[PDB]
């Protein structure tokens, strides 16, 4: 993904918004015939979990607990998951040696149950204001409803019947003179250790304190398990109910697991001329493909193009064997030996075929970029078939063109 530079050769997406992304990041949509990007697809929320103590919490409990773990804590000074140490328990960090004793929080007899965050200072005033505005909003709703049904009736405010407990909040008292800056600030050395930085100030927003002794450790933030759903298609992919300590997908779907992935095996000279060898591995068990197209003339956004890649080669039938094969186990005649193609095809191993592209570098100053279209026989299986019961000839016949953009090192 990162070790090999997947962020070089990119695949194009069809729709409203055109995007150039690596095949590793993209997803293939099986309901229809069009691969779509992580940007294009809509995101959902499945499950919440703590990154320290991996515990799958339900959606209801998260809303009550404000998307936080009760047991785990993150240090305020540096941003790292704290650890309980005994002597009878105090909270301490590994990276920085900030303790819970420093700020002056008393040690608890019970390990987890004892620790808590103080109640918000303006929580009582809050509820009183909500209830005042709630009652006041309810009056406007009744007024707006009464006005709307009178318009809908269209009786011109005809008086058939006779027309027409209060909550009163006291408004906050305005101070005559606000407290001045203490005379300590004048003629006193300022230790930058004692006062807190903006980053660690703002992590505790309810009462962001200037001094470090006031700054208490906040609960550790819960992380999210994303599930993707498309515009046209319904489902796409999702994750299990035990995503904590699991790398399994409930429905595995990705562009590399359907569309044939292209990789630049060899990179030649960048001095005005060369011959680059690229591989075209298949992922499907049995299929056919072809890199025939030259991306037309000024069509399909070929603005990035800074070279003329010929790739004048007819289709080559490659197949993947999901099994541990030996070094040159058997030599097939019709697949390998019959299309010898010594100039075009470099090598043909198991689920692998090297192809020579004749690029024209140094058309611009530098940063050589090549546009070429790749075709493949997509066994869609859109119609109802149990273990390939249906023939799926019309599906296999369908030729899907992916506009690839390979970027040479330069």
């Amino acid at each position: 993904a990162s070790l090999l530079q997947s962020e070089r050769v990119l695949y194009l997406v069809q729709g409203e918004k055109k995007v150039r992304a690596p095949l590793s990041q993209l997803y293939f949509c099986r309901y229809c015939s069009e691969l779509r990007s992580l940007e294009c697809v809509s995101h959902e929320v499945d499950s919440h979990y703590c990154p320290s103590c991996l515990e799958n919490m339900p959606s209801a409990e998260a809303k009550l607990k404000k998307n936080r773990c009760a047991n785990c804590f993150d240090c305020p000074g540096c941003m790292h998951t704290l650890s309980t140490r005994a002597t009878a328990y105090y909270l301490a960090c590994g990276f920085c040696r900030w303790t819970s004793r420093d700020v002056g929080m008393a040690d608890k007899s019970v390990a987890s149950g004892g620790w808590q965050e103080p109640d918000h200072p303006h929580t009582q005033r809050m509820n009183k204001l909500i209830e005042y505005y709630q009652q006041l909003a309810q009056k406007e709703k009744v007024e707006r409803d009464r006005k709307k049904l009178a318009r809908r009736r269209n009786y011109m405010p005809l008086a058939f019947s006779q027309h027409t407990k209060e909550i009163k909040i006291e408004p906050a008292q305005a101070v005559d003179e606000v407290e001045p800056l203490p005379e300590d600030y004048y003629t006193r050395p300022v230790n930058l250790t004692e006062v807190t930085t903006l980053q660690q100030r703002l992590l505790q927003p309810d009462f962001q304190p200037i001094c470090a002794s006031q700054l208490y450790p906040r609960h550790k933030h819960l992380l999210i398990k994303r599930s993707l759903r498309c515009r046209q298609c319904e489902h796409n992919l999702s994750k299990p109910e035990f995503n904590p300590t699991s790398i399994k997908f409930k429905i595995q779907l990705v562009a590399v697991n359907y569309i044939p992935e292209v990789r630049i095996m060899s990179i030649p000279n960048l001095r005005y001329m060369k011959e680059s060898q690229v591989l075209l591995t298949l992922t499907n068990p049995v299929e056919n493909l072809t890199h025939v197209t030259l991306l037309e003339c000024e069509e399909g956004d070929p603005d990035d193009t800074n070279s003329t890649a010929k790739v004048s080669v007819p289709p080559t039938e490659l197949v993947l064997a999901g099994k541990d094969a030996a070094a040159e186990y058997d030599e097939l005649a019709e697949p390998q030996d019959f299309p010898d193609d010594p100039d075009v095809v470099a090598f043909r191993k198991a689920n692998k075929v090297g192809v020579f592209i004749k690029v024209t570098p140094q058309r611009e100053e530098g940063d050589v970029t090549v546009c070429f279209k790749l075709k493949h026989d997509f066994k869609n299986l859109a119609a109802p078939i149990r273990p390939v019961e249906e023939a799926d000839p019309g599906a296999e016949v369908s030729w899907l063109t992916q506009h690839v953009e390979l970027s040479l090192g330069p």
Binding site: Y133, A172, Y185, T197, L198, R201, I224
Partner: protein
């Protein structure tokens, strides 16, 4: 119905959380770390192409709705707090991102000043908003914002950060750790905005009116021989590990004065209240004066509220404002949440009102049909 989310996109920091809460859940720098870019690009930028702005806001809102808040965007409503006279194309884009990409049920474009008034409970009050870009004031009288008597000056965070950078480069004394124990000037051509902001918050403070008025005349040096008050002690600040910048005591209490300096025009952060209040209707004068509100993170700076209220009462006695605003009692309101998170708290208090929210707010079905967001400009 579900508890509607509140977002407040600012140049420096964005406030995020859920309605009917004591304060915002997440507050973070309004930036995004794009691959290739060493410094992260700012998400809100006025006067750029729509497509480039659309991509930045799409990237940012995604981070807010998944990494910071954990909730589906399509399920529950939005309460977008944005200041009055926010650029047209920016607000149009922000809504278009929420309605098209995320497919939110309904957005409510509340003005920050009217939201700040709800938190106190008082129906009428003057509201000063000392933000990053511009320090804006807007009188709110019994629910109606008075756009006629608006006021704005570029004396916020950005103007203060720039002033600090200028002063530090003049009196530049850093200990690199390479025979740089001796005072070394301007080793680095520019100082990054992240450092300048941290220096401002920790080192620099707002002086008293009496001491400040002397500092103004001192640096001017208006036919006087060393008429400055005794500064605080010099604070040593680390830059990128090894390099230790010695911050001069004069810089700490002089950097702030650019806000409260008259500069001939008679245009300070203090004057902007009195300039607006004098332009207000004659009946509204005494009610607005008595109910002052000071929001924005720039006013959090230590001893700002005392200097402002003092500087007001001094500028009152000045002959221009002496006639109209002579015998007026200026009293400041202390909001429940902190000065930075007053704007957000209003939107949450408003978001808790499910019945009024749905009616006032613009539904997606209306936007998809029309493609016209309602504004204070003509329809």
């Amino acid at each position: 119905e579900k508890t509607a989310v509140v977002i407040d996109l600012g140049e420096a920091f964005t406030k995020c959380g859920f309605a009917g809460e004591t304060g915002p859940r997440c507050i973070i720098p309004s930036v995004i770390k794009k691959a290739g870019m060493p410094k992260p690009i700012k998400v809100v930028q006025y006067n750029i192409n729509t497509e480039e702005l659309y991509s930045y806001l799409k990237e940012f809102i995604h981070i807010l709705y998944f990494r910071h808040l954990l909730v589906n965007p399509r399920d529950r409503r939005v309460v977008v707090i944005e200041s009055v006279l926010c650029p047209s194309h920016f607000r149009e884009t922000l809504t278009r991102v929420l309605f098209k990409y995320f497919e939110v049920p309904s957005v409510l474009l509340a003005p920050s000043h009217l939201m700040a008034l709800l938190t106190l409970g008082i129906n009428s009050a003057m509201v000063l908003d000392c933000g990053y870009r511009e320090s804006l004031v807007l009188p709110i009288y019994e629910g109606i914002p008075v756009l006629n008597c608006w006021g704005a000056l570029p004396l916020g965070g950005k103007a203060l950060h720039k002033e600090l950078e200028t002063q530090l480069l003049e009196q530049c004394t850093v200990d690199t750790g390479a025979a740089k124990e001796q005072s070394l000037p301007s080793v680095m051509g520019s100082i990054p905005e992240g450092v300048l902001e941290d220096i401002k918050v920790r080192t620099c403070f707002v002086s008293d009116l009496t001491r400040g008025l002397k500092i103004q005349a001192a640096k001017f040096n208006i036919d006087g021989n060393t008429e400055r008050p005794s500064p605080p002690p010099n604070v040593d600040y680390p830059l990128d590990g090894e390099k230790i910048l010695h911050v001069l005591g004069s810089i700490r209490d002089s950097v702030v004065e650019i806000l409260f300096e008259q500069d001939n025009e008679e245009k300070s952060v203090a004057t902007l209240i009195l300039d607006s209040l004098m332009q207000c209707p004659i009946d509204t004068r005494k009610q607005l004066a008595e109910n002052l509100v000071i929001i924005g993170g720039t006013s959090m700076l230590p001893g700002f509220l005392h200097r402002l209220l003092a500087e007001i009462r001094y500028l009152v006695e000045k002959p221009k404002y002496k006639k109209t605003l002579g015998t007026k009692t200026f009293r400041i309101h202390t909001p429940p949440a902190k000065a930075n998170c007053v704007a957000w708290l209003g939107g949450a208090i408003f978001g808790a009102l499910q019945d009024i929210l749905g009616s006032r707010s613009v539904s997606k079905e209306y936007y998809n049909q029309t493609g016209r967001i309602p504004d204070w400009c003509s329809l």
